[PDB]
Amino acid sequence: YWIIHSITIPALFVAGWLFVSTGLAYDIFGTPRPNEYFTQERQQVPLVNDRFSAKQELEDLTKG
C-alpha cells in the first residue's frame, strides 16, 4: 500500500502542480492569462454573438 503510494501520489501531485505552473491549463481550457484579458484593438468585454460562427468568432477574439 504505502510502497506504491509513496511514488504515485507525490508524482501525481507534482504533475498537477506543473499543469498550472507550465501554463498548460490556460492553453487547454482557454482561460485567459492575467495579461491577455483586453487586447490593444479590443478594450471591451469579448462576447460571442452568433452560435453557428462561435468557433470562428472565438478564434478571431483569441488570436491576439
Partner: protein, 341 residues
C-alpha cells in the same frame, strides 16, 4: 442461467457500495457531472459568456467560483462537444459555456439514476418506495429551476450558474425581474421548508425528551438497541405534553412521519410550480389595484410599493453587467435613486 440473469446476480451482490442496474446510469452520469463542475470551477473561465472571472485559476475562491451558464448567443442548444457550436474543439466548447450544459444534462440523468437506485434498493430490500417519491421534490426543483426556467426564457444564459455567489446572484436577479417573494407558490414553498425544519427540530426534541429510562447511565444513547420490540420513547407523554402546551398533538406515529415527509415535498412542488410560472414571465409581480391607487395618490405608500421600487433598482443597476450581451448603457440620469424620486 442466462447472461442477463448472471449480470442481474452480479449487480445485486451485497458489496460495500451497491451497484444495481440503476448504477449503470447513475455512477457515470453523476461522476461526470461532479467532475465537470470541479473542472469548471477550477480551470474554466466565464470571460467570453458573462464577462466574468469564475475559476480558481483566475483568482476566485470557493464562494465566487462557478460553472457559468452558456452565452446568450447560444439559444437553447444542447451544446454537444461535437455540435455545430464547438465542432469538436474542447477549448471553444469550454469557452462558450458548454461545460455548464455537460454538467446540467449529466446531472439530470444522475438524478434520474439515483431515483431509480432508490426504487431498486427499495424493491430488493422489500419495503415501500416512499424514497424516490420524496426525492421527486429535489428532482422537480432541479428540473424547474435549471431546465424548465431557461427553456422558457431566451437561452441557457438565464439559468442559475453552478456556484455559491452565482446562486446568490440568481436569487437577487429573480427577485428584481419577477418579484418572486410576492409569488404565492414561492410562499407555499417557504412555508413547506420552514415547517419541515420545524418538524425535524420539534420531533427530535420531543423524542429525546420523552425517552423511557431504559438504562442506569446518565448518557442515554446506550439504552437503545436496534433489536427492540418496545418503543424507546413515550408517545403518550409526548401527546399529553403537546396537547396541553400547543392545544393539539400527534397521536399516530405513522401519520406524524408521513406528515414530516409530506410538508417539504409539498413545499418543493409548489415552489416548482411557481418557478415554472416564472419561466414564461407569468409572474405575480404586481397588484393592479395597488398600482392604480399609487398612480392617482402620490401620498399612498405601502411596503409593496417600496418592494416594487427596490426591484426596479436591482433591474436597472444590474442589467448592464448581468446581461453584457444586450450592451445596456444607462446614463446616471435614468438610473433610479431614492433621492430625486
Amino acid at each position: 442461467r442466462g447472461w442477463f440473469d448472471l449480470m442481474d446476480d452480479w449487480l445485486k451482490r451485497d458489496r460495500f457500495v451497491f451497484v444495481g442496474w440503476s448504477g449503470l446510469l447513475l455512477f457515470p452520469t453523476s461522476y461526470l457531472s461532479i467532475g465537470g463542475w470541479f473542472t469548471g470551477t477550477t480551470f474554466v473561465t466565464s470571460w467570453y459568456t458573462h464577462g466574468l472571472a469564475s475559476s480558481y485559476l483566475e483568482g476566485c475562491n470557493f464562494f465566487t467560483a462557478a460553472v457559468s451558464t452558456p452565452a446568450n448567443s447560444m439559444g437553447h442548444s444542447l451544446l454537444l462537444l461535437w455540435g455545430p457550436e464547438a465542432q469538436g474543439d474542447f477549448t471553444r466548447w469550454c469557452q462558450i459555456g458548454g461545460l455548464w450544459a455537460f454538467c446540467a444534462l449529466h446531472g439530470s440523468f444522475g438524478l434520474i439514476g439515483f431515483c431509480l437506485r432508490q426504487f431498486e434498493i427499495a424493491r430488493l430490500v422489500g419495503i415501500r418506495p416512499y424514497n424516490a417519491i420524496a426525492f421527486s421534490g429535489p428532482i422537480a426543483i432541479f428540473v424547474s429551476v435549471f431546465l424548465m426556467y431557461p427553456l422558457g426564457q431566451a437561452s441557457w444564459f438565464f439559468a442559475p450558474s453552478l456556484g455559491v455567489a452565482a446562486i446568490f446572484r440568481f436569487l437577487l436577479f429573480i427577485q428584481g425581474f419577477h418579484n418572486f417573494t410576492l409569488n404565492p407558490f414561492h410562499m407555499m414553498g417557504v412555508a413547506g421548508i420552514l415547517g419541515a425544519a420545524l418538524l425535524c427540530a420539534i420531533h427530535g426534541a420531543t423524542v429525546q425528551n420523552t425517552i423511557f429510562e431504559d438504562g442506569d447511565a446518565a448518557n442515554t444513547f446506550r439504552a437503545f438497541t436496534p433489536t427492540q420490540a418496545e418503543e424507546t420513547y413515550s408517545m403518550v407523554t409526548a401527546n399529553r405534553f403537546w396537547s396541553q402546551i400547543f392545544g393539539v398533538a400527534f397521536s399516530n406515529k405513522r401519520w406524524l412521519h408521513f406528515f414530516m415527509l409530506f410538508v417539504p415535498l409539498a413545499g418543493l412542488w409548489t415552489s416548482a410550480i411557481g418557478i415554472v410560472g416564472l419561466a414564461l414571465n407569468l409572474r405575480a409581480y404586481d397588484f393592479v389595484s395597488q398600482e392604480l391607487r399609487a398612480a392617482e395618490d402620490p401620498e399612498f405608500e405601502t411596503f409593496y410599493t417600496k418592494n416594487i421600487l427596490l426591484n426596479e433598482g436591482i433591474r436597472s443597476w444590474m442589467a448592464a453587467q448581468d446581461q453584457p450581451h444586450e450592451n445596456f448603457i444607462f446614463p446616471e440620469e435614468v438610473l433610479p435613486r431614492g433621492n430625486a424620486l
